Amino acid sequence: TGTDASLSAGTVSGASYAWYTDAGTSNQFSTLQNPTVNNLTNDSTFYLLVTVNGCPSALDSTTVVVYPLTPSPSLPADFAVCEGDDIALSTSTVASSYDWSGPNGFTSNAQNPVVITNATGSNAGVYTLSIVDGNGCSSADTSVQVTVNAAPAQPSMTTNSPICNGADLVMSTSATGNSYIWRAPNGADTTTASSTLTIVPTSSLYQSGNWTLSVVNAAGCVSPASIASAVEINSIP
Amino acid sequence: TGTDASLSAGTVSGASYAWYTDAGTSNQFSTLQNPTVNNLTNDSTFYLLVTVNGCPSALDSTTVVVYPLTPSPSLPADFAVCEGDDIALSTSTVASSYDWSGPNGFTSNAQNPVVITNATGSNAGVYTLSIVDGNGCSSADTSVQVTVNAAPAQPSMTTNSPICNGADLVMSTSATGNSYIWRAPNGADTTTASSTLTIVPTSSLYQSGNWTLSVVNAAGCVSPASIASAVEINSIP
């Protein structure tokens, strides 16, 4: 639908040809044996008359069949990722070929493009997909905007001085965010709703050694970790 | 099966041609020397009449042979792997060419595609195979869904303080799972059904030095190892 096509009469030696737009040869279309038709949008018909020595043969009708319009391909709704995430694009439809494009020269010929990892802010933008249905027709393009959010900078850490065992251990940051993450020297993970953590001596978090902190932003986007500080928990004489 | 084909009369100077859909020239098909036939789904026949100066020759029958439909290629049943595993796809059938596709732009022309290693969750999805039988016919596609499971995060480890030789050594984690793995400093491997391991002084596991733990999930999917802790086993005056 929307393109041009040819008509084609057989060859009769010495014959003239004439094509007419309708039956009853009321309106002449052309004089060529193989004329073309422009801009076919739907099924139509043509009528061929063949004349030899001034005598026409029975009018020959033909139909040029117009393939039906293709559907737009289907992409997901506007999505959003953080810079620490990836961008996985795909389509749910069926095509003989896919044609994807995007912000960083992104491209793919598949229904399952390569996932962009480390999808930092430079990959934010609009991704576009066009398809071909295998019967020779393209489809109109559709697109998805991808938003890329980002983590805040690594927080600083303030802790108590060397502390003797049995006294409460306090750790805090000046960083702001939605929640705070502390990572114990042995890997223990604890979160808190505010910038200050207090560790009770009977806690599994009562650990000397190198501690780090990271900060949770809106929509995840956790900061890189802080530079570790060393906690020293001392014995008592 | 399913495509179009041509018929072809020999050339006689000055002859007209006529093709008929059946014997007895009851229904005319065409007037071309080399007409086409659309949508052949099974064997059919055509009848050619050649006429010179108004006199027909004996009716010439031809058969257009339609190759038989191809079988679908054969893929394995829905399989499943963990992120620490690989994905090995292959097909049991025979083709002149294979056409594989998948989630991360995965593709192959072989019956034995390259195995995806480090088959993390981004490779989960549906893999598809189409084939060509070598006689010019494609087969309908078939597909296999591949599920990718995943390991839990590395566990933390809690152990006893420096211990004197002869006292039982206890190691434990707060991590949850189906079973627990401890790795001794010299490589000794021991598993337990719960989070706490007790080591008897006469055991081969009575080892000072750096110990790690990993956790078994449902369907394998063993966690990355914990940060090693050091066990100190002391002498007695």
Side-chain angles (χ1 to χ4, degrees):
Chain A
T1 298
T3 192
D4 301 332
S6 64
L7 307 175
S8 179
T11 298
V12 179
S13 175
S16 64
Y17 299 100
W19 298 81
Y20 277 110
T21 66
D22 205 351
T25 66
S26 66
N27 183 45
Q28 187 168 3
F29 180 70
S30 179
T31 60
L32 300 171
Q33 182 186 125
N34 298 284
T36 61
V37 180
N38 299 325
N39 194 28
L40 286 166
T41 62
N42 208 325
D43 287 350
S44 179
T45 61
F46 298 87
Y47 297 84
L48 170 66
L49 191 69
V50 180
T51 299
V52 179
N53 299 325
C55 297
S57 63
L59 191 64
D60 176 21
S61 63
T62 66
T63 301
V64 181
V65 175
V66 175
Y67 278 124
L69 288 170
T70 54
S72 300
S74 174
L75 299 180
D78 290 349
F79 65 99
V81 301
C82 188
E83 291 195 319
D85 294 317
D86 53 3
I87 296 167
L89 305 175
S90 68
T91 178
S92 65
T93 190
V94 177
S96 70
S97 68
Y98 300 82
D99 182 353
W100 295 84
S101 64
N104 288 338
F106 171 80
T107 183
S108 174
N109 296 321
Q111 76 276 35
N112 299 333
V114 174
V115 174
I116 300 168
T117 62
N118 299 322
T120 63
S122 67
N123 286 290
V126 178
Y127 292 82
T128 299
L129 172 66
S130 297
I131 62 168
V132 178
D133 65 357
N135 291 315
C137 293
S138 66
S139 294
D141 52 290
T142 191
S143 65
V144 176
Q145 183 171 337
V146 180
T147 296
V148 180
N149 201 333
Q154 60 271 32
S156 67
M157 180 183 283
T158 299
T159 72
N160 289 337
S161 74
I163 187 166
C164 291
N165 191 324
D168 285 348
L169 171 63
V170 178
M171 303 177 71
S172 67
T173 184
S174 67
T176 61
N178 291 68
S179 66
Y180 299 81
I181 302 166
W182 283 256
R183 180 72 62 181
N186 68 5
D189 183 337
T190 180
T191 58
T192 74
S194 69
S195 64
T196 299
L197 170 67
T198 300
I199 299 168
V200 175
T202 64
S203 173
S204 67
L205 297 172
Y206 213 54
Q207 297 177 36
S208 66
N210 287 320
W211 283 81
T212 61
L213 186 149
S214 63
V215 178
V216 179
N217 204 344
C221 289
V222 176
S223 72
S226 67
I227 298 168
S229 69
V231 174
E232 179 177 296
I233 302 172
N234 283 311
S235 67
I236 299 170
Chain B
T1 298
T3 192
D4 301 332
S6 64
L7 307 175
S8 179
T11 298
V12 179
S13 175
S16 64
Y17 298 100
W19 298 81
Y20 277 110
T21 66
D22 205 351
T25 66
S26 66
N27 183 45
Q28 187 168 3
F29 180 70
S30 179
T31 60
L32 299 171
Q33 182 186 125
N34 298 284
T36 61
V37 180
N38 299 325
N39 194 29
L40 286 166
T41 62
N42 208 325
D43 287 350
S44 179
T45 61
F46 298 87
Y47 297 84
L48 170 66
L49 191 69
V50 180
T51 299
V52 179
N53 299 325
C55 297
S57 63
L59 191 64
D60 176 21
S61 63
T62 65
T63 301
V64 181
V65 175
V66 175
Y67 278 124
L69 288 171
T70 54
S72 300
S74 174
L75 299 180
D78 290 349
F79 65 99
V81 301
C82 188
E83 291 195 319
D85 294 317
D86 53 3
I87 296 167
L89 305 175
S90 68
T91 178
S92 65
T93 190
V94 177
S96 70
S97 68
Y98 300 82
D99 182 353
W100 295 84
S101 64
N104 288 338
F106 171 80
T107 184
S108 174
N109 296 321
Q111 76 276 35
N112 299 333
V114 174
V115 174
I116 300 168
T117 62
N118 298 322
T120 63
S122 67
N123 286 289
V126 178
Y127 292 82
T128 299
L129 172 66
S130 297
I131 62 168
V132 178
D133 65 357
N135 291 315
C137 293
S138 66
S139 294
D141 52 290
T142 191
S143 65
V144 176
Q145 183 171 337
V146 180
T147 296
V148 180
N149 201 333
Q154 60 271 32
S156 67
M157 180 183 283
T158 299
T159 72
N160 289 337
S161 74
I163 187 166
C164 291
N165 191 324
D168 285 347
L169 171 63
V170 178
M171 303 178 71
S172 67
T173 184
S174 67
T176 62
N178 291 68
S179 66
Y180 299 81
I181 302 166
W182 283 256
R183 180 72 62 181
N186 68 5
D189 183 337
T190 180
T191 58
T192 74
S194 69
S195 64
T196 299
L197 170 67
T198 300
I199 299 168
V200 175
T202 64
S203 173
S204 67
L205 297 172
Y206 213 54
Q207 297 177 36
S208 66
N210 287 320
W211 283 81
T212 61
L213 186 149
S214 63
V215 178
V216 179
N217 204 344
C221 289
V222 176
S223 72
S226 67
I227 298 168
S229 69
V231 174
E232 179 177 296
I233 302 172
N234 283 311
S235 67
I236 299 170

